[PDB]
């Protein structure tokens, strides 16, 4: 089955599950060429990002088609649509598949032969194959029961030289460390309660944030029941995961239960099989964002203040109206204990399949699949205004600027319903002639995908604590939604063969999609695939194969992008809205995204060539592929001048191109009876380039970014994901321009480009030891190149806690190349600068970025990471015998163990995001919770 003419990689269930990840994809993190895999954060139950051969869908569908058996699997993601204020991620659609049920993963990377799996495959395909029947030993029972801990990985690097203050002076109530140097003397701090105040030695507490986190605990129990006959098989499996991550409280919870029954039977001629699965999950998230969240509240802590000393609510000085600081921030323990952010999800999926062979050389297959889900979100936050505003310092004593106004409380609840039906009806033809072999396939595809939700929200809570749609004296808000798309296609795949030496393939498919304009539903995309095993004395060249392919992969549009719509009126204003009805009048407005019925289908073309060779009875192996992908005519709501009536128009874009090289080398230097040593090296390098966005709308469109701030674009000449940010003004000679009077840099007239999102190259290095029953595998993940936004640096800068801001021992400094612009009528003259950033304004110099200003907070995306370690002891059969056991493997493991990051980056594990497992996530990380080290044990027991 290496007739394949495009890159692809197979993995064995044992490798998948040996890392004991609660997920199927996060284990292969840095292990396969041209499969970029990153989890969104170390928060339990979150999404994983899997992008193959570059971002092609400029917004925002770049996951590959996961296909289980082989029915497409739903890969829907559930993250917040407002990462700046309420951040969370509740899951990837594939996170629900039980790794212990995987028998073989095969990632097809090539966009050229995709007609079997259709339009979604242009993103790659993740073909999973579930474990099946016996006979074996043995009653047919496996059991892996694991137990792991988790510890904080990288906290930002802090300064332990100056404590609580602002402008450099001492303050009792600040939320940052711009204070005098550490005397050791005794000063006050915190609010005043009942004519008393706390009083502590002014000394740094270097571990006060590290001490905040506990050790996350997660137990996992799995179980399978297996057996087979000459005409049947049957597999039943169950799995439970229960995580409580390293943030204090049950606030970071993930519970996963699955169930699965998979049976086949042959009686004929006729075969019928059926896979059915149920999957539960209950996540609770420790929200992120710029508001009153747990992390943004934690980082805003002076270096001398003891965090763990704030938990005890019986200590009045820690209750909310007397918390040590009022500046837009709350005790992080109170946040994790009184805010709610829950999700619960029930899902049913599976397939029916009826094979029927006939006339010697033919086979019939029908395959229906259904993947229905029901998920219920529930968030709510106290009425802090009613509980604490009157009569407290934080408080009535803080006027409008109190953190409590106007937090009058909120509760909301959304119930989502998803459902996909896929249908395949195929016929297959397999006849040898002389030395040839002809395999044909003709079929029909049917796909129906629908999603809907009912959301209801309620504000200003009457009983300040209780979360319930009946608990509020003000009008409630109500939202409702539903999308439904359908697709039908006809397809055919021809497979030719000559004495197991040449393998030629030709595919053709034609889809009618519901999302495209009526007079242009149909699109057609063929392909061709060659494999040559130029390996037909030695005994020295085991296997040699050369690969090429030229194919297309049409695609439709998102839903409802043709016709114009009149939404109910509503006006986006900074940090609010004005939404009709008002008052007693309802209203509709003309929709701000201009439709278009001239759309034509998207069309991806790919060229690929490859080469695979082995030596010395597969003791030295390598594989190389060169690819050239072009995703043309993509249907995108492209940005437009608001003066035109609309804010964007739906039109076919130009080519988004990914060229690159993918290389795998693997060898066994030592292989002796009792001892084998294995090396593996994989290297991917990819060249993103947007080739041309429609000119009439300008050059660029925004993919994500802040307002008046660091935003991330897609620009005509440039890669997918160009950043811009405020950069300081330079004279035509050097030369930081600074204000003649304060000393601080002067923002240049525009934002300067400051880098794309992409890695320049990605590679990993892996090694495996086997000595008797002992296994040892180590895997390193190396990604170098690119840049990302980090409020984690920003807020630690603003706050005077990052080590960086102990530069001039906070003594007043003159920016070391500074110069002044001297404007007389209309003549530009630069003077050697004489004005110093005073002590009082050192804060502002850093809060804004230093000499880089806003672009300061674009961090090097680059890291080396100790991905995983798997020590495995396979007990010898001779040790059992007297026992019911048929095999026992004790396993001890650790994941995301250590991360090494350039030098500009003392702030984040670069593997973070607050904008979801796809394109928009590459924007950055808006105080994502710390990433985490993981390590545990695992006990396999066959029966």
């Amino acid at each position: 089955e290496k007739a394949l003419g495009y890159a692809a990689t197979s993995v064995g269930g044992e490798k998948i599950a040996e890392s004991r990840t609660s997920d199927v994809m996060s284990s292969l993190a840095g292990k396969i060429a041209g499969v970029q895999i990153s989890s969104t954060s170390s928060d339990p139950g979150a999404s994983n990002s899997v992008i193959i051969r570059g971002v092609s869908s400029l917004s925002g569908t770049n996951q590959p088609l996961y296909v289980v058996d082989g029915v497409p699997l739903n890969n829907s993601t559930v993250y917040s649509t407002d990462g700046l204020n309420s951040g969370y991620d509740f899951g990837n659609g594939a996170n629900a598949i039980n790794p212990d049920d995987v028998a073989n993963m095969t990632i097809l990377k090539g966009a050229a032969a995709t007609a079997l799996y259709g339009s979604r495959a242009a993103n790659g395909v993740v073909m999973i194959t579930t474990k099946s029947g016996r006979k074996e030993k043995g009653v047919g029972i496996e059991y892996n029961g694991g137990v792991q801990w988790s510890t904080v990985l990288r906290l930002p690097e802090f300064q332990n030289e100056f404590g609580m203050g602002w402008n450099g002076n001492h303050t009792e109530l600040e939320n940052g460390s711009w204070g005098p140097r550490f005397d050791g003397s005794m000063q006050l701090w915190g609010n005043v309660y009942n004519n008393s105040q706390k009083l502590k030695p002014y000394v740094a507490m270097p571990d006060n944030i590290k001490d905040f986190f506990d050790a996350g605990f997660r137990y996992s129990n799995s179980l399978s029941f297996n057996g087979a006959t000459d005409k049947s098989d049957y597999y039943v499996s169950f799995s439970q995961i229960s995580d409580d991550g390293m943030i204090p409280t049950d606030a970071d919870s993930y519970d996963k239960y699955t169930f699965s029954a998979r049976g086949s039977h042959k009686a004929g001629a006729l075969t019928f099989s059926s896979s059915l699965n149920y999957a539960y999950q209950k996540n609770n998230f420790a929200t992120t964002g710029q508001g009153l969240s747990m992390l943004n509240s934690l980082y805003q802590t002076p270096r001398d203040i003891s965090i763990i000393g704030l938990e005890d609510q019986n200590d009045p000085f820690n209750t909310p109206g007397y918390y040590y600081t009022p500046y837009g921030v709350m005790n992080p323990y109170y946040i994790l204990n009184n805010y709610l952010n829950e999700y619960e999800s029930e899902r049913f999926y599976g397939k029916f399949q009826l094979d029927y062979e006939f006339l010697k050389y033919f086979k019939f297959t029908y395959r229906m699949g259904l993947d229905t889900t029901t998920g219920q979100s529930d968030k709510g936050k106290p009425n802090l205004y009613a509980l604490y505003y009157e009569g407290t310092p934080n408080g009535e004593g803080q006027g409008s600027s109190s953190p409590f106004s106007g937090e009058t409380g909120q509760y909301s609840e959304q119930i989502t319903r998803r459902r996909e039906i896929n249908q395949d009806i195929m016929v297959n033809f397999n006849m040898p002639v002389n030395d040839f072999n002809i395999n044909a396939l003709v079929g029909f595809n049917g796909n129906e995908r629908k999603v809907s939700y009912q959301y209801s929200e309620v504000n200003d809570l009457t009983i300040p604590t209780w979360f319930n749609l009946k608990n509020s004296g003000k009008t409630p808000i109500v939202e409702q939604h539903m999308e439904l798309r359908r697709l039908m296609g006809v397809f055919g795949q021809f497979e030719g063969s000559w004495k197991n030496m040449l393998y030629l393939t030709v595919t053709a498919r034609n889809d009618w999609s519901s999302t495209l304009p009526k007079e242009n539903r149909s699109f057609f995309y063929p392909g061709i695939t060659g494999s040559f095993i130029f390996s037909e004395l030695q005994d020295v060249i085991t296997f040699g194969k050369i690969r090429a392919s030229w194919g297309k992969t049409g695609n439709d549009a998102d839903v409802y992008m043709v016709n114009p719509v009149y939404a109910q009126s509503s006006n986006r204003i900074p940090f609010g809205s004005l939404t009709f009805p008002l008052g007693g009048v309802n209203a509709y407005s003309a929709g701000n995204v201009l439709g278009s019925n001239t759309l034509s289908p998207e069309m991806t073309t790919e060229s690929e060539v490859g080469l695979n060779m082995a030596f010395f009875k597969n003791r030295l192996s390598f594989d190389v592929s060169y690819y050239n992908r072009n995703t043309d005519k993509q249907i995108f709501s492209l940005a437009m001048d608001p003066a035109s009536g609309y804010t964007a128009q739906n039109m076919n874009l130009g080519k988004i191109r990914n060229r690159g090289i993918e290389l795998l080398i693997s060898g066994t230097p030592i292989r002796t009876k009792d001892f084998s040593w294995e090396l593996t090296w994989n290297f991917t390098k990819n060249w993103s380039k947007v080739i041309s966005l429609p000119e009439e709308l300008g050059g660029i469109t925004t993919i994500y970014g802040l307002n008046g701030g660091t935003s991330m674009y897609a620009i005509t000449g440039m890669p997918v994901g160009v950043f811009k940010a405020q950069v300081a003004e330079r004279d035509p000679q050097g030369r930081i321009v600074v204000n003649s009077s304060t000393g601080l840099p002067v923002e240049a007239s525009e934002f300067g480009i400051c880098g794309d999102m992409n890695n320049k190259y990605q590679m990993g290095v892996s090694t495996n030891l086997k000595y008797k029953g002992i296994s040892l595998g180590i895997d390193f993940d190396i990604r170098q190149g690119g840049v990302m936004y980090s409020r984690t640096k920003d807020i630690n800068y603003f706050t005077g806690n990052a080590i960086q801001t102990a530069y001039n021992d906070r003594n007043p400094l003159i920016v070391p190349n500074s110069v002044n612009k001297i404007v007389n009528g209309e003549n530009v003259t630069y003077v050697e600068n004489t004005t110093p950033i005073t002590s009082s304004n050192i804060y502002k110099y850093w809060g804004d970025g230093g000499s880089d200003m806003g672009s300061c907070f674009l961090v090097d995306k680059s890291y080396v990471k100790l991905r995983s370690v798997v020590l495995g002891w396979d007990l010898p059969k001779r040790w059992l015998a007297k026992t019911p056991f048929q095999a026992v493997k004790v396993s001890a493991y650790g994941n995301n163990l250590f991360v090494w990051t350039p030098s500009s980056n003392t702030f984040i594990d670069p593997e973070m995001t607050s904008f979801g497992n796809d394109l928009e996530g590459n924007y950055g990380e808006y105080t994502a919770n710390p990433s985490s080290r993981r390590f545990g044990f695992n006990l396999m027991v066959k029966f």
């Binding site: 986006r572 940090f575 802040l706 307002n707």
Partner: peptide
């Protein structure tokens, strides 16, 4: 539009 941040307190 384009999402707005917020400066803090000091």
């Amino acid at each position: 539009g384009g999402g707005g941040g917020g400066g803090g307190g000091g």
